[PDB]
Amino acid sequence: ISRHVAIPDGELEITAIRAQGAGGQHVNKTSTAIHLRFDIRASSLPEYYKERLLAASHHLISSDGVIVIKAQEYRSQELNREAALARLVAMIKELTT
Amino acid sequence: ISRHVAIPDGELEITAIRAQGAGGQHVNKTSTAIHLRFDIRASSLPEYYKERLLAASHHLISSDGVIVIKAQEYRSQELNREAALARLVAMIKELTTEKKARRPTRPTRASKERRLASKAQKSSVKAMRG
Amino acid sequence: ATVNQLVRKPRARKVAKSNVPALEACPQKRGVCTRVYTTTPKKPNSALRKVCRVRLTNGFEVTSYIGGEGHNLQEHSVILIRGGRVKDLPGVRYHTVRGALDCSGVKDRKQARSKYGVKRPKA
RNA sequence: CCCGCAGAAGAAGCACCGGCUAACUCCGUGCCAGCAGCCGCGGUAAUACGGAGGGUGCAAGCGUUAAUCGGAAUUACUGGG
RNA sequence: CGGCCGCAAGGUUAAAACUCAAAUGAAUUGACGGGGGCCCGCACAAGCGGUGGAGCAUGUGGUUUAAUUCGAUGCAACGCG
RNA sequence: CGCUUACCACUUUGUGAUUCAUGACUGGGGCGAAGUCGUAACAAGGUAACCGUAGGGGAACCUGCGGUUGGAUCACCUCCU
RNA sequence: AGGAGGUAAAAAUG
């Protein structure tokens, strides 16, 4: 009737960088395995989604629209990416639909 | 993300039947342009959603799933097409919203205050033998 | 004393409430044991205790805590029950006996082995 | 029931051990797993959770559940406010 | 809930299931009051000389940066370690 | 013997009483949780509070009328004998 | 010692 696709864009940062929170001494220096991403704002999702998500006070995002999601509750990186990706699937459409 | 309404041409049977209501002799002779749909469940293709569009009860769709929309407001056949084409999208995509909610709730800051509390009540249970 | 008030209104043999609304004087009752879940206790504690609602064969739709380790029950799994409450989960006043026709015990609980309907290891 | 054979041969586990209410330490997991009739025990040093050692109670029976009475002078005429 | 009464709002009579193992009374103690008493301290009153305005030295925040080490950061941190 | 009068159980039907399950949906209560924001109530709680009655209001509650204490507070200054 | 009379300003919130 109307083919809607939840396709993963290429304009998102898959970088295994530092986690944010607590954890003793490992959280202050190293902090790997936690997918802290950035969904570059001036890119695709043609202006309809970009500024639509910016006119709303939200957590786990930047002030510019480079959404910074933290994926913590998963042990393997295959599932930690799923924690990061699946959150964005629900996150962007939350401020869209 | 990438949204372009499909609604397959050559897959949707459109039936033009007469209208209903008041309005003179105009409403009962050349008001056959009014539209009534015919969207069978056999043109599914998601494999899982169309059956979830059939099981959950709602109108516009019978007990078999041949989805019909008898639009009676317009005077042209053109407006009957697009208005009936929008509701088919407005029913199916609205009903296919099978919310992947989530859970749960397990006390995580209760026992950082609750824990020190009861153990401090140990002095309350010292009113005995020494 | 007010004996004239007593000759009219006698000494009421006050009947107390029951802690087991299953059936009158029943030692046990067979339950259809439905909808398995796990909920949190109250102010005294905090844990993830396995519990189960009980569709009774006398007609009741009650609740019961599953005191045990081995999960040998599901959607139906018709079991038996013994009275008594847990005092820590607000609402439960029964117990899932770990020795029913359906529910067996847990292996390797040597100390006080008659507990949880565990069969005594002859080894 | 009595006489003879008669290798101890064929004949012991259950609950509980913080207090109430007789009986202690150690190890493993960490308000997690679980326990209980009551108060409650468990946040890496648990006499209360699980096991081991030992102890206590009882005995071919022992605990658990349920019901009645006493406990309960918490229906009090006996015998309360 | 039912009965009774009322123009109505309601009144009178009067439960149960369920849920907790506490609720409550008395008096005792610290604290606060733009509450009072009594009393002290440069607290005020009576006077003197300074800060704030200017320049300079130093410390902190903020900012910036490859780093501008870290901690203290109401009285009782800021010429402090 | 046959026939028939009266009485009567059962059944059927009309119309009520009462009682027991179930009923989409909806209201009130408790509990855990304690996510939210409020900080009512308690020192006179920064407006003393409680009871009855009436109105208002997002919530604790507010306000008018009457009653109770299960509420406080009694110094200096000026003057006089 | 008894007794009469006089006397005072508002200010929210953790």
Swiss-Prot record, chain A:
Its EC number is 3.1.1.29. GO terms for cellular component: cytoplasm. Changing G24A: Decrease in activity. Signal peptide: none annotated. One of its GO terms (molecular function) is translation release factor activity. It catalyses: an N-acyl-L-alpha-aminoacyl-tRNA + H2O = an N-acyl-L-amino acid + a tRNA + H(+). It is found in: Cytoplasm. One of its GO terms (biological process) is rescue of stalled ribosome. It is an enzyme of class 3 (hydrolase). The keyword Hydrolase applies. The keyword Cytoplasm applies. Transmembrane segments: none annotated. Keywords: Cytoplasm, Hydrolase, Translation regulation. Rescues stalled ribosomes. Can hydrolyze peptidyl-tRNA on ribosomes stalled by both non-stop mRNAs and mRNAs that contain rare codon clusters or ribosomes stalled in the middle of mRNA. First identified as a complementary ribosome rescue system when the stalled ribosome cannot be rescued by the SsrA(tmRNA)-SmpB quality control system or the alternative ribosome-rescue factor A (arfA). Associated with 70S ribosomes and polysomes. Belongs to the prokaryotic/mitochondrial release factor family. The unstructured C-terminal region is required for ribosome binding and peptidyl-tRNA hydrolase activity. The C-terminal tail functions as a sensor to discriminate between stalled and actively translating ribosomes by binding in the mRNA entry channel downstream of the A site between the head and shoulder of the 30S subunit. This allows the N-terminal globular domain to sample different conformations, so that its conserved GGQ motif is optimally positioned in the peptidyltransferase center (PTC) to catalyze the hydrolysis of peptidyl-tRNA. This is Peptidyl-tRNA hydrolase ArfB. It comes from Escherichia coli (strain K12). The chain holds residues 4 to 100 of 140 of the full protein.
Swiss-Prot record, chain C:
GO terms for molecular function: misfolded RNA binding; rRNA binding; structural constituent of ribosome; tRNA binding. Changing L56H: Protein is not incorporated into ribosomes. The modification 3-methylthioaspartic acid is found at D88. GO terms for cellular component: cytoplasm; cytosol; cytosolic small ribosomal subunit; ribosome. Pfam families: Ribosom_S12_S23. GO terms for biological process: cytoplasmic translation; Group I intron splicing; maintenance of translational fidelity; positive regulation of RNA splicing; response to antibiotic; RNA folding; translation. At least 19 substitutions or deletions in 11 codons can promote streptomycin resistance, dependence or pseudodependence; all but one of the streptomycin resistant mutations (K42R) are associated with hyperaccurate translation and thus reduced translational efficiency. Belongs to the universal ribosomal protein uS12 family. Part of the 30S ribosomal subunit. Contacts proteins S8 and S17. Interacts with ArfA. May interact with IF1 in the 30S initiation complex. With S4 and S5 plays an important role in translational accuracy. Interacts with and stabilizes bases of the 16S rRNA that are involved in tRNA selection in the A site and with the mRNA backbone. Located at the interface of the 30S and 50S subunits, it traverses the body of the 30S subunit contacting proteins on the other side and probably holding the rRNA structure together. The combined cluster of proteins S8, S12 and S17 appears to hold together the shoulder and platform of the 30S subunit. This is Small ribosomal subunit protein uS12. The gene is rpsL.
